[PDB]
Amino acid sequence: AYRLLNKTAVITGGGSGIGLATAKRFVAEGAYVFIVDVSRKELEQAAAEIGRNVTAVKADVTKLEDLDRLYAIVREQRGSIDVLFANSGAIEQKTLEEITPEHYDRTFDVNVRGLIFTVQKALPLLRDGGSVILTSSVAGVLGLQAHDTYSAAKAAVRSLARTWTTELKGRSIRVNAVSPGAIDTPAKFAAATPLGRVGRPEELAAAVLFLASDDSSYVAGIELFVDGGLTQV
Amino acid sequence: AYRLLNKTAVITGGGSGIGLATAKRFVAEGAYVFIVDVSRKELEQAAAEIGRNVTAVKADVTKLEDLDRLYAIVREQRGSIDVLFANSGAIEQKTLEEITPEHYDRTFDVNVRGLIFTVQKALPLLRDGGSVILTSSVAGVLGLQAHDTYSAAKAAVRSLARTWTTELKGRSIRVNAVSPGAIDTPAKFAAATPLGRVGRPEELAAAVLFLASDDSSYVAGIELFVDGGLTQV
Amino acid sequence: AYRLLNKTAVITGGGSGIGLATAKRFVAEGAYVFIVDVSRKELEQAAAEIGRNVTAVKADVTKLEDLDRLYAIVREQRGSIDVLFANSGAIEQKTLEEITPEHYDRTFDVNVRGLIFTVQKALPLLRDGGSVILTSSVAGVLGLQAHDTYSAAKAAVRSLARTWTTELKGRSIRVNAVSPGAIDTPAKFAAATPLGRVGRPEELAAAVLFLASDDSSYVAGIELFVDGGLTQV
Amino acid sequence: AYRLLNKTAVITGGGSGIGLATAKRFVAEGAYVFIVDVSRKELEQAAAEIGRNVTAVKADVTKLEDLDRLYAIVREQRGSIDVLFANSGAIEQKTLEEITPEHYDRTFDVNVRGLIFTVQKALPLLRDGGSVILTSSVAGVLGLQAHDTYSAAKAAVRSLARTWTTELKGRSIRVNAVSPGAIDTPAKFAAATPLGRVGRPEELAAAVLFLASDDSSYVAGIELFVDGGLTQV
């Protein structure tokens, strides 16, 4: 009944949207969860909503020193990590001719750099046999107007799942990417989507649970699309 | 606790290997299971192993009339299908120059023709919101010596999950393909596999469970690789 | 200037459309061409059009004996084959529920069976270092309404490039798939195509030329989409 | 006879390797080539090797002002660009745990940042109906030990081809990625490569030529693997 019973999870971008829904589903599956996000208020809100088996950590994942502090706290409170959901994502729309150094640095900092160090700094705490879920996107295999740097960064995220799969294999740590389509997070995607609707954060959390749990024990390096068929037809 | 509580599942190739493994896991999850295979004896053994909530049906899914009789039995005992796992596979190893018309016919009849019809005739029993999983293979994306027809036919399988995704969306039926790598069924594959081992049939069953269950509610038209990272790296 | 000077090419579906367009280009690049097709009239028109270095052979390539006759003619006139463009293809729209045994058989015969035996029976004639191009389709990676068997069969054709690449590597023979989008042969595809138009048969011929010629000597096993962007964005 | 007769090509990384191979082949095909790179010595040597119809321009394509300056020179000397080969590439091997912020910044600046601004700044000179080729890599779809950032950056590159295809379709500018496998540039990869050898730089230049020429006029948004079958089987 409790597919994650007594496992320790760390979830970044855990103050809202898909991170928050995964946190809630994880606690329901018997996990202890760390939610990590930038906004104090949102973390307090999110933790109260989760209500049990949860520590909230204020951290900007793009800042290395913030990650060291995160992982000291994790070390102190629970001692190790069974599941890491390295969830990050910020989309700013700009076409090629509109891109600035600035737009670029911010897109890649948040979507790639901070993901890379999130996972790097977590290695000393990851148990052998553990599971890492990277958030990529449908955008990482599409050519969408004005999504130049976002799509490119999320294709970078999916690649990291293959490299890490090779690198961490000696510790039996699985690394997989989840690639959400349109998720209803606080229409064109809905139009071309076979299931005919945006997905719910609940549905994305369920897909990450699979990747998190022993049910995906032979599943490694994959890109799991959770996009109601958007990219598959 | 029970992730297919009271759903009715149909599994073809249900008398052994991943079909049997899936049926045991499905019953564990509170589903009622129809196992379907060619051998009365194997089916009797299989049913005893599963032990409850199972009907065994002798059908050669490459024969249209056998599928008629299958679905009539399913219809009289349970009235509709929630999960159809259309699981077939016959592999015979011939290189291009060794291919006979009989080898071609048998390989495609069991892997493609029989699957098509299996799914066509399940249509009138399948519930709206139901889930259909097809058994593809990592061979469907690899260039493997002497696997000419089997690999070709398994790609045909993965393609059908796309077309069916588009054709059944009007009914909310999700169609997805599972692509197993090496599975231990009663070393070279294992050597190139990042998890470093063959998978257990129960690990394949678990991945089919995900597709079968509400956790995959926003997943449609995918190829789910269950191959320890073989095709991913 | 003459990219295929003194090369012997065999082209199936040679009497119209992409097959004829490829023959014409292959002739203008200095090749000696066999066009193979079922209709005498079309072949005579085609040979007249091509105008030089061409033998037209009336063969149904789904028939093993028509292939034996074809290749005895190839062997006696030109000896061995530098380039085989095993271009097959026919489509009939039927949804899953409309699928008949006749429909499936006819689709798989034309699109897969004949293609396997075409390439099988060319083996003793293929020069070492020669090039085999298969016609697949964008359909082999899409979920198109009512394209069930045509798409499934084209995916199979793409898979044969991979396996054949492994099997004939000893003889340095490259096998690659070409996947056309919409080609103009005497809107909806054109609507979703970035280039905003259907392809000319001449453009597909140019892509096949590339696989045919030395320019692609390091390219093997691939699926070259020629669809003005259809499957890529 | 001359496939780029009087076309203006801009090639970055043009002082060595596949850049230089491509410049040479392009001049053979009657183009006027600008070779762009960091080292004056290397540029001078490469310009003498090519021999005719070439300007060498010293530039760090990671610097916006060096690019403004490149395009001023191109604008003055030739007025417009028909073919842009945005070829960039630096690899340094580091495993995840070895990654420094500096290792990360260098890989992405060169392989991605530089690439974006290269094409962005080419836009006012690019003729309508022009052709843009981006160098990706087989690394972009593999999990190779210690290739974390390079493979990731190369997957970003492939994505950009998709996004640009959509952004630029209004001008009929085609954008495609070439993904080299192992290339002999001044055994492990040969081992898993169906062709059984490394690719020659001339062979990569031929493939880029295809993308640059009118033969690929209906080809957009693709990843063209030129890797002897490495990623295809």
PDB file of C-alpha atoms in Angstrom, chain B residues 64 94-101 104-105 108-109 112-114 116-117 119-120 123 139-149 151-153 155-157 159-160 162-164 166-168, chain C residues 64 94-102 104-105 108-109 112-113 116-117 119-120 123 139-149 151-153 155-157 159-160 162-164 166-168:
ATOM      1  CA  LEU B  64     -10.030 -15.007 -36.127  1.00  0.00           C
ATOM      2  CA  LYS B  94      17.080 -16.234 -39.670  1.00  0.00           C
ATOM      3  CA  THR B  95      19.417 -13.867 -41.560  1.00  0.00           C
ATOM      4  CA  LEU B  96      18.110 -12.122 -44.714  1.00  0.00           C
ATOM      5  CA  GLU B  97      19.497 -14.806 -46.977  1.00  0.00           C
ATOM      6  CA  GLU B  98      17.936 -17.594 -44.844  1.00  0.00           C
ATOM      7  CA  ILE B  99      14.369 -16.122 -44.860  1.00  0.00           C
ATOM      8  CA  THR B 100      11.705 -18.435 -46.295  1.00  0.00           C
ATOM      9  CA  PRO B 101       8.122 -17.371 -47.038  1.00  0.00           C
ATOM     10  CA  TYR B 104       8.092 -14.599 -42.868  1.00  0.00           C
ATOM     11  CA  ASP B 105       4.430 -15.663 -42.530  1.00  0.00           C
ATOM     12  CA  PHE B 108       4.289 -11.612 -38.947  1.00  0.00           C
ATOM     13  CA  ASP B 109       1.171 -13.638 -38.283  1.00  0.00           C
ATOM     14  CA  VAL B 112       1.425  -8.363 -36.159  1.00  0.00           C
ATOM     15  CA  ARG B 113      -1.653  -9.932 -37.803  1.00  0.00           C
ATOM     16  CA  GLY B 114      -2.761 -11.652 -34.562  1.00  0.00           C
ATOM     17  CA  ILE B 116      -4.224  -6.375 -34.911  1.00  0.00           C
ATOM     18  CA  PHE B 117      -7.186  -8.705 -34.705  1.00  0.00           C
ATOM     19  CA  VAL B 119      -7.206  -5.574 -30.425  1.00  0.00           C
ATOM     20  CA  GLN B 120      -9.932  -5.071 -33.107  1.00  0.00           C
ATOM     21  CA  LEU B 123     -13.061  -3.087 -29.178  1.00  0.00           C
ATOM     22  CA  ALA B 139      14.626  -5.230 -31.307  1.00  0.00           C
ATOM     23  CA  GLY B 140      12.164  -2.735 -32.868  1.00  0.00           C
ATOM     24  CA  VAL B 141      14.948  -0.022 -32.707  1.00  0.00           C
ATOM     25  CA  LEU B 142      18.146  -2.204 -33.037  1.00  0.00           C
ATOM     26  CA  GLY B 143      19.989  -3.827 -35.941  1.00  0.00           C
ATOM     27  CA  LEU B 144      20.482  -7.346 -34.572  1.00  0.00           C
ATOM     28  CA  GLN B 145      22.024 -10.235 -36.567  1.00  0.00           C
ATOM     29  CA  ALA B 146      19.355 -12.773 -37.725  1.00  0.00           C
ATOM     30  CA  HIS B 147      16.428 -10.840 -36.185  1.00  0.00           C
ATOM     31  CA  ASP B 148      15.252  -9.456 -39.487  1.00  0.00           C
ATOM     32  CA  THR B 149      11.555 -10.343 -39.314  1.00  0.00           C
ATOM     33  CA  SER B 151      12.693  -6.791 -35.235  1.00  0.00           C
ATOM     34  CA  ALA B 152      10.659  -5.612 -38.266  1.00  0.00           C
ATOM     35  CA  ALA B 153       7.401  -6.995 -36.855  1.00  0.00           C
ATOM     36  CA  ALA B 155       8.530  -2.043 -34.913  1.00  0.00           C
ATOM     37  CA  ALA B 156       5.191  -2.627 -36.602  1.00  0.00           C
ATOM     38  CA  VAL B 157       3.801  -3.158 -33.059  1.00  0.00           C
ATOM     39  CA  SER B 159       3.668   1.960 -34.721  1.00  0.00           C
ATOM     40  CA  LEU B 160       0.218   0.576 -34.010  1.00  0.00           C
ATOM     41  CA  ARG B 162       0.467   5.441 -32.303  1.00  0.00           C
ATOM     42  CA  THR B 163      -2.278   4.948 -34.829  1.00  0.00           C
ATOM     43  CA  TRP B 164      -4.546   3.444 -32.112  1.00  0.00           C
ATOM     44  CA  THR B 166      -5.318   8.570 -32.552  1.00  0.00           C
ATOM     45  CA  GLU B 167      -8.189   6.222 -33.454  1.00  0.00           C
ATOM     46  CA  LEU B 168      -9.382   5.463 -29.917  1.00  0.00           C
TER      47      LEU B 168
ATOM     48  CA  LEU C  64       9.319 -14.695 -55.941  1.00  0.00           C
ATOM     49  CA  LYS C  94      -8.903   1.664 -43.153  1.00  0.00           C
ATOM     50  CA  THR C  95      -9.435   2.255 -39.390  1.00  0.00           C
ATOM     51  CA  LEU C  96      -8.754  -0.672 -36.972  1.00  0.00           C
ATOM     52  CA  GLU C  97     -12.358  -1.706 -36.841  1.00  0.00           C
ATOM     53  CA  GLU C  98     -12.543  -1.711 -40.677  1.00  0.00           C
ATOM     54  CA  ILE C  99      -9.418  -3.886 -41.102  1.00  0.00           C
ATOM     55  CA  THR C 100      -9.999  -7.124 -43.096  1.00  0.00           C
ATOM     56  CA  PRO C 101      -7.540 -10.015 -43.557  1.00  0.00           C
ATOM     57  CA  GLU C 102      -7.425  -9.091 -47.262  1.00  0.00           C
ATOM     58  CA  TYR C 104      -3.728  -6.448 -44.109  1.00  0.00           C
ATOM     59  CA  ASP C 105      -2.260  -9.107 -46.439  1.00  0.00           C
ATOM     60  CA  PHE C 108       2.083  -6.204 -45.877  1.00  0.00           C
ATOM     61  CA  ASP C 109       2.761  -8.094 -49.161  1.00  0.00           C
ATOM     62  CA  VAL C 112       7.140  -5.546 -46.515  1.00  0.00           C
ATOM     63  CA  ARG C 113       7.136  -9.035 -48.015  1.00  0.00           C
ATOM     64  CA  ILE C 116      12.354  -8.403 -48.058  1.00  0.00           C
ATOM     65  CA  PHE C 117      12.559 -10.749 -51.065  1.00  0.00           C
ATOM     66  CA  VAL C 119      16.633  -7.281 -51.287  1.00  0.00           C
ATOM     67  CA  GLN C 120      17.267 -11.023 -50.520  1.00  0.00           C
ATOM     68  CA  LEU C 123      22.254 -10.194 -52.560  1.00  0.00           C
ATOM     69  CA  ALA C 139       3.823   7.501 -41.515  1.00  0.00           C
ATOM     70  CA  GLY C 140       6.254   4.998 -39.864  1.00  0.00           C
ATOM     71  CA  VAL C 141       6.694   7.400 -36.873  1.00  0.00           C
ATOM     72  CA  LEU C 142       3.131   9.064 -36.831  1.00  0.00           C
ATOM     73  CA  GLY C 143      -0.408   8.055 -35.605  1.00  0.00           C
ATOM     74  CA  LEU C 144      -2.529   8.864 -38.701  1.00  0.00           C
ATOM     75  CA  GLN C 145      -6.236   8.099 -38.773  1.00  0.00           C
ATOM     76  CA  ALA C 146      -6.927   4.955 -40.821  1.00  0.00           C
ATOM     77  CA  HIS C 147      -3.204   4.343 -41.703  1.00  0.00           C
ATOM     78  CA  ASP C 148      -2.976   1.411 -39.364  1.00  0.00           C
ATOM     79  CA  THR C 149      -1.315  -1.219 -41.607  1.00  0.00           C
ATOM     80  CA  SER C 151       2.283   2.961 -41.062  1.00  0.00           C
ATOM     81  CA  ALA C 152       2.995  -0.340 -39.310  1.00  0.00           C
ATOM     82  CA  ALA C 153       4.470  -1.737 -42.513  1.00  0.00           C
ATOM     83  CA  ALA C 155       7.982   1.191 -39.583  1.00  0.00           C
ATOM     84  CA  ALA C 156       8.946  -2.409 -40.410  1.00  0.00           C
ATOM     85  CA  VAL C 157      10.713  -1.234 -43.572  1.00  0.00           C
ATOM     86  CA  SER C 159      13.739  -1.496 -39.048  1.00  0.00           C
ATOM     87  CA  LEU C 160      15.096  -3.626 -42.045  1.00  0.00           C
ATOM     88  CA  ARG C 162      19.087  -1.352 -39.282  1.00  0.00           C
ATOM     89  CA  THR C 163      19.235  -5.153 -39.397  1.00  0.00           C
ATOM     90  CA  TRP C 164      20.527  -5.209 -42.902  1.00  0.00           C
ATOM     91  CA  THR C 166      24.495  -5.216 -39.372  1.00  0.00           C
ATOM     92  CA  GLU C 167      24.157  -8.217 -41.669  1.00  0.00           C
ATOM     93  CA  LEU C 168      25.786  -6.927 -44.836  1.00  0.00           C
TER      94      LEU C 168
END
